[PDB]
């Protein structure tokens, strides 16, 4: 089976498709959604990452900022201020961003790192 | 109809020795040295690795990540070999008991003897103790005497946890003996499979608790 996934940014639809499994990290702890699942509302951690897993492709890793997450009978919906796919990230820019003193951009950089497979 | 703690015995320098209890121990030791030299004969760096090599590397980096998150690896790398030693040497030492002997059966466990387990546990003790004082030279004041129990606990715990664990099978395989032969094979198989499992898990536990006791001996 498969579950419908939709990631919407504040001013754009980041992604929309179907998936086999969906891993992310709520403020309360990491979590993995599967095609059927309890209705749920949660808030992703500040430097969260979203790994979508699809049947015939390679898994799609996304960095998310200020995200919220909700699972319903129709599928998963992730609400983000901003999102950045894995094949769009400068790991060195994200690295120097990670060592900032500003918590917000530090979390942005940590998420961009998590997406690229570092940290 | 059966009585536990019976193995042949003798003496060597006034100390009493088990005439049993040492043959299967040496079988385990020579097996580990064997597969180790077999590794060395079929080791590689840029090939496809042999089954022995993949087995041992899985074990090795498992223990390695355990150590490194428990302690800074550089701080005490010497525990990594000591860990692997403990694992395989105990693993086989229980799995050696899989083979069927009884007519009285003396190919069975080395851990069914209190002294073998006592030696392993108290060696682990001397090592992490000297490591603790090598590093440094309770959480509440009046809680302190409990702490005294704590480190007298660990070698005891490590010792009897293993003995009783294998001794269990060391008894059960005997009991089931007097169960009728035309039926005994099925519970025999069931218990033997579960004993394989428990031996594996128990070697795992002894190794992991070894590492963690090293750690809490060596942190700061």
């Amino acid at each position: 089976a498969e579950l419908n996934v939709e990631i919407v940014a504040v001013d754009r639809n980041i992604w929309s498709g179907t998936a086999k499994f969906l891993f992310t990290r709520t403020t309360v702890g990491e979590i993995g959604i599967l095609p059927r699942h309890i209705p749920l509302v949660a808030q992703l951690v500040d430097d969260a990452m979203v790994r979508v897993e699809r049947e015939g492709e390679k898994d799609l890793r996304i960095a998310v900022d200020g995200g919220f997450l909700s699972v319903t009978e129709e599928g998963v919906s992730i609400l983000a201020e901003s999102a950045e796919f894995e094949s769009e990230i400068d790991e060195a820019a994200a690295k120097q961003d990670s060592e900032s003193d500003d918590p917000r951009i530090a979390a942005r950089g940590r998420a961009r790192l998590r997406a690229v497979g570092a940290i | 109809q059966i009585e536990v703690g019976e193995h042949h015995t003798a003496t060597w320098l006034g100390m009493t020795v088990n005439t049993d209890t040492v043959l299967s121990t040496a079988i385990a030791g020579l097996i580990v040295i064997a597969l180790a030299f077999y590794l060395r004969a079929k080791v590689t760096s840029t090939d496809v690795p042999g089954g022995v090599q993949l087995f041992f590397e899985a074990i090795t980096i498992q223990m390695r990540n355990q150590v490194e998150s428990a302690i800074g690896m550089r701080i005490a790398p010497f525990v990594l070999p000591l860990a692997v030693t403990i694992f395989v040497f105990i693993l086989i030492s229980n799995w050696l008991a899989v083979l069927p002997v009884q007519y009285t059966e003396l190919l069975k466990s080395a851990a069914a003897d209190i002294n073998y387990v006592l030696a392993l546990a108290l060696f682990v003790f001397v090592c992490y103790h000297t490591a603790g004082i090598w590093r440094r030279g309770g959480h509440v004041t009046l809680l302190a005497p409990i702490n005294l129990v704590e480190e007298v606990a660990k070698p005891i715990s490590l010792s009897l946890r293993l003995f009783g664990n294998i001794f269990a099978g060391g008894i059960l395989v005997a009991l089931i003996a007097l169960f009728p032969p035309y039926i005994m094979w099925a519970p025999n198989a069931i218990w033997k499979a579960f004993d394989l499992f428990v031996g594996a898990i128990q070697a795992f536990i002894f190794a992991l608790l070894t590492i963690l006791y090293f750690s809490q001996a060596m942190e700061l």
């Binding site: 990491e30 | 946890r161 009783g164 608790l209």
Partner: protein
């Protein structure tokens, strides 16, 4: 007499095994509860959760088998005859 000691040893061994069984059974139950919940909350976490789980079990069953050993010492090599 002698049989009185034998009976005392049998009852004592029984108590030791009963305590061991209660402890091990409930301890493994309460540990597996967390294991299943973790695997239900995150599946790819299974291979991870098998490290703390079996640590816990290694402790729990330990107390069990120690008792088992002493039960033998009570029943077969009774200390006082």
């Amino acid at each position: 007499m002698d049989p009185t000691i034998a009976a005392g040893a049998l009852i004592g061994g029984g108590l030791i095994m009963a305590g061991g069984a209660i402890g091990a059974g409930i301890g493994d139950g309460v540990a597996g509860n967390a294991l299943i919940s973790g695997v239900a909350r995150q599946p790819e976490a299974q291979g991870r959760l098998f490290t703390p789980f079996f640590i816990t079990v290694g402790l729990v069953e330990a107390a069990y088998f120690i008792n088992l050993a002493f039960m033998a010492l009570f029943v077969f090599a009774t200390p006082v005859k």
